[PDB]
Structure formats: structure tokens, C-alpha cells
């Protein structure tokens, strides 16, 4: 006892338990994945509807930090909105100061040093949020970064965050990043977001998809989920 309470105390085996408890706090939240193609970044978040709870489009875990950068948060939600406001403000500082649009590398550093900066004191608690960062610029290419509650930021071609995490990142190695256009990769996400999280746990669900890349011309926005409706047209035909 006594080694798990505060964040600033090492445990005798040599790890920090508040950080380890922060890692598996995101483990209870629902699955949200991401993947990049050769010219764009595709997001997808499965969202939970039990009976009535909310109007369609409530508390969307897809955010929009800059003109060309977006979030895909999973875990506890309020601190994820706090990181959305802070990363928003950091893009405002870089945009105001140095005159050009923020690269995804500096944004990953300046956010990840804050997420780390709340794991050094017993003033605060470590965050309980993990989020994706997708972007595209013609002098940059599509990058996809992944920030955990511990503060580690690095780069995937594809990732997954949630309960069904390993099962939802098992199948991504079947897909090919290098050749595919992202317009395929939309339904190529929605097929396994429909496949993972089988409906015995929760009766119903609802899907969000957000898509930035070359076709949207740098601007990040949600795809019109009604428009082309490619998800469930493949997904009801993907059970057999």
C-alpha cells in the first residue's frame, strides 16, 4: 500500500502506477480506429446508442483542431475536450506567430509535452485521454500520430483505441496502405467497424467517419454520412 496513490512516487519494481491506471482507464471506452492512405487520412469512431439517449450528432468524439488537423478521442471525454481547447490554442499561437500552417510534428510535441507535464506533480492527475491526429499537406504528406495518456507520441500507418482494440487492429494488416485510394478506405474502415464490437454487448450503435486528405483539398471535415452511404451497403452484405 501507499505506492499507488500519488503520481510522483515510484513503485519499488520501478514503474508509476497512476500512469498505469491512466492507461487502462481508456481501455473501458469504445473502439475508435484510424488509418492513412497514400494521399489522405481516414478516421472512424463507433458510437454507442442504447435506447434513446441523445440526438444524432451529440458529443462527437471527432473534433477539428486546425484547418487541416483533427482529433479522434477515446477514453474519458471531458479532458479530451480540454486537450482539444489547448491544441486549438497552440495552433493559434503557431499560426499567429510564424505565418504558416502548423506541421503535425510540432503539434504532437507541444501537446505531448503537456500530457507529460501533468504526470510530474501531485498537484494534478495524469490525463485519461488518448487521441488520433490526422493531417495532409502537399509539402508534407499524410501523417498520423498517436498520443497516449503517458505522453508517448509516435507514428502509425494505422491504429485503434478502445475496448475492442487488439481485435480491431488485427485486420488492418490485411489492408494495403501504399496503393489504395482513401475513397475505398472509407468503406474499408466501415466494414470492420461494423464487424468489431459484436451486438451482444450493446444492442445498437452508430458510426462517425471523418476524412482529410488530397480530395478534400487540405480542409478537414466530416464526410456526409448520408452521401454515398457506402458503409452499411457493404456492411449488411459482409455478414456471410
Amino acid at each position: 500500500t501507499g505506492y499507488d496513490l500519488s503520481a510522483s512516487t515510484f513503485s519499488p519494481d520501478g514503474r508509476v502506477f497512476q500512469v498505469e491506471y491512466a492507461m487502462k482507464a481508456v481501455e473501458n471506452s469504445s473502439t475508435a480506429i484510424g488509418i492513412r492512405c497514400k494521399d489522405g487520412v481516414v478516421f472512424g469512431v463507433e458510437k454507442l446508442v442504447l435506447s434513446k439517449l441523445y440526438e444524432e450528432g451529440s458529443n462527437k468524439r471527432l473534433f477539428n483542431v486546425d484547418r487541416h488537423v483533427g482529433m479522434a478521442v477515446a477514453g474519458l471525454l471531458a479532458d479530451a475536450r480540454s486537450l482539444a481547447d489547448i491544441a486549438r490554442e497552440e495552433a493559434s499561437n503557431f499560426r499567429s506567430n510564424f505565418g504558416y500552417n502548423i506541421p503535425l510534428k510540432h503539434l504532437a510535441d507541444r501537446v505531448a509535452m503537456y500530457v507529460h507535464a501533468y504526470t510530474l506533480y501531485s498537484a494534478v492527475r495524469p490525463f485519461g485521454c488518448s487521441f488520433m491526429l490526422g493531417s495532409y499537406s502537399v509539402n508534407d504528406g499524410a501523417q498520423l500520430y498517436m498520443i497516449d495518456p503517458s505522453g508517448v507520441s509516435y507514428g502509425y500507418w494505422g491504429c485503434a483505441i478502445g475496448k475492442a482494440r487488439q481485435a480491431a487492429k488485427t485486420e488492418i494488416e490485411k489492408l494495403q496502405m501504399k496503393e489504395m485510394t482513401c475513397r475505398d478506405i472509407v468503406k474499408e474502415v466501415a466494414k470492420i467497424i461494423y464487424i468489431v464490437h459484436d451486438e451482444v454487448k450493446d444492442k445498437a450503435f452508430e458510426l462517425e467517419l471523418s476524412w482529410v486528405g488530397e480530395l478534400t483539398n487540405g480542409r478537414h471535415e466530416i464526410v456526409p454520412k448520408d452521401i454515398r452511404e457506402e458503409a452499411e451497403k457493404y456492411a449488411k452484405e459482409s455478414l456471410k
Binding site: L5, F17, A25, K52, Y54, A78, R81, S122, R125
Partner: protein
């Protein structure tokens, strides 16, 4: 239970207990029901009193020319987020010379009540807001929580035994969209008459009803302009 101490300490299960205990402070407040149409928003509360002689403690308080909020739980913190609510309304009313839409107001409540849920020695706010107003795209019914997670619903209810209000609302959510005010309100407080035991009224001296509309500024009625609404309801079944 040594990790039930403060807001800083995470659980070994991943559930920060001070937030759960503050949700328990939400459930101890009285019932209130907010529900919208496509053209209006109605939130109805139920007062309780300390004794017979003391007047019933009010819930619905006026905030802006279109924004109104219910409450359950603590009262002083409701005055605190009330004063912050007024001040962030008339800030942008002072600067931009337009009223604020609701959907960017509530992010100031989340980013306002966030920091007292993280740093040491700061309690969360025992709070029960049911926000209602107009932006240009119609009505909205939100709710808050001490964990600062705001939900865009079509109808909710928070307070003591408010789950019965929900299980009333789900079998009428397909019919709570087109109808105008006079049956929308009584469709509101039928959920309140299911939040009570079935052997006492449903009086006139306790229920308060607030409506926000397009050609109708946000208005609170109190027992006597309420008395034209409570007339003509069905009897509680055997």
C-alpha cells in the same frame, strides 16, 4: 477506501470516485424534465419544501432573453455557475452585439467545471443543469454533469427517481416532435406525475414550467399562470 480520498487519485479500476460521489449529489435533487419539439423547448421542474410553512424552494431561474436552465443538487454552486452564465452571456452580447448560440455556451461550462475536477483541493460542482434556448437552428435541450460531459438529447430528466420519467418518455418520443405548446407541456409534466408516489398530488403550488420560443421570450410561470395548464389532465390509474 484510501483511494476514495481526493480528486487527484485514480482508482485501480479506472473510475475516479469523487465524480461518482458528485453524481450521487445529482441524484439527490428533485425531479425535473426538459423536452423539445421542433418549434419549441419546454422544461418542467418539481419543487419541494422543507416544511408546511416554508415556501417551496424554486428550481427554474431566468438567465438570458432566450437561455434558461433548470437545476438539481446544490444551490450555492448553482448561483456560481449562474453568475458565470450571465457574465459569459453579456460579454459576447457586449462585444459582438448578437446573442450567443447555446452550443458554444456549454463548452465554457465544460471548460469552467473542468479545472476544479483535476487540480488538488478542488471539489467538482454538484450541478443539474438542463439548458434550453434558441440559436438560429431551433431549440436545444442539453444536460450537464459534474464530470463535465454535456449531452445533446431530445429529452432527459435528472433528479430523484427520474428513471421513471425516462421510461415514460421513450414510448412517446415518436410523438414529441410535431405538437404545439398546450399538449407539449402536459406531455412534459406527465413525466413529473410518474416521478411521484401515486397517492399524493400533483398540486398547483409546486410545479414550475419554463418555455422558450421564437415569438415567445423565456418565461417562468409560478402556480397561478400554471393553474391554466394543470386543468384537464387524466386520472392516475388504479
Amino acid at each position: 477506501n484510501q483511494y476514495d480520498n481526493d480528486v487527484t487519485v485514480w482508482s485501480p479500476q479506472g473510475r475516479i470516485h469523487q465524480i461518482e460521489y458528485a453524481m450521487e449529489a445529482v441524484k439527490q435533487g428533485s425531479a425535473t424534465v426538459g423536452l423539445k419539439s421542433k418549434t419549441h423547448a419546454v422544461l418542467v421542474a418539481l419543487k419541494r419544501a422543507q416544511s408546511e410553512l416554508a415556501a417551496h424552494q424554486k428550481k427554474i431561474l431566468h438567465v438570458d432573453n432566450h437561455i434558461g436552465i433548470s437545476i438539481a443538487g446544490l444551490t450555492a454552486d448553482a448561483r456560481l455557475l449562474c453568475n458565470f452564465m450571465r457574465q459569459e452571456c453579456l460579454d459576447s452580447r457586449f462585444v459582438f452585439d448578437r446573442p450567443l448560440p447555446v452550443s458554444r455556451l456549454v463548452s465554457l461550462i465544460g471548460s469552467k467545471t473542468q479545472i476544479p475536477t483535476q487540480r488538488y483541493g478542488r471539489r467538482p460542482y454538484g450541478v443539474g443543469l438542463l439548458i434550453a434556448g434558441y440559436d438560429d437552428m431551433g431549440p436545444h435541450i442539453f444536460q450537464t454533469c459534474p464530470s463535465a460531459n454535456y449531452f445533446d438529447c431530445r429529452a432527459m430528466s435528472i433528479g430523484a427517481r427520474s428513471q421513471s420519467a425516462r421510461t415514460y418518455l421513450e414510448r412517446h418520443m415518436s410523438e414529441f416532435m410535431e405538437c404545439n405548446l398546450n399538449e407539449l407541456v402536459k406531455h412534459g409534466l406527465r413525466a413529473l406525475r410518474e416521478t411521484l408516489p401515486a397517492e399524493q398530488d400533483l398540486t398547483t403550488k409546486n410545479v414550475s414550467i419554463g418555455i422558450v420560443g421564437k415569438d415567445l421570450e423565456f418565461t417562468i410561470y409560478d402556480d397561478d399562470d400554471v393553474s391554466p395548464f394543470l386543468e384537464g389532465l387524466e386520472e392516475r390509474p388504479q
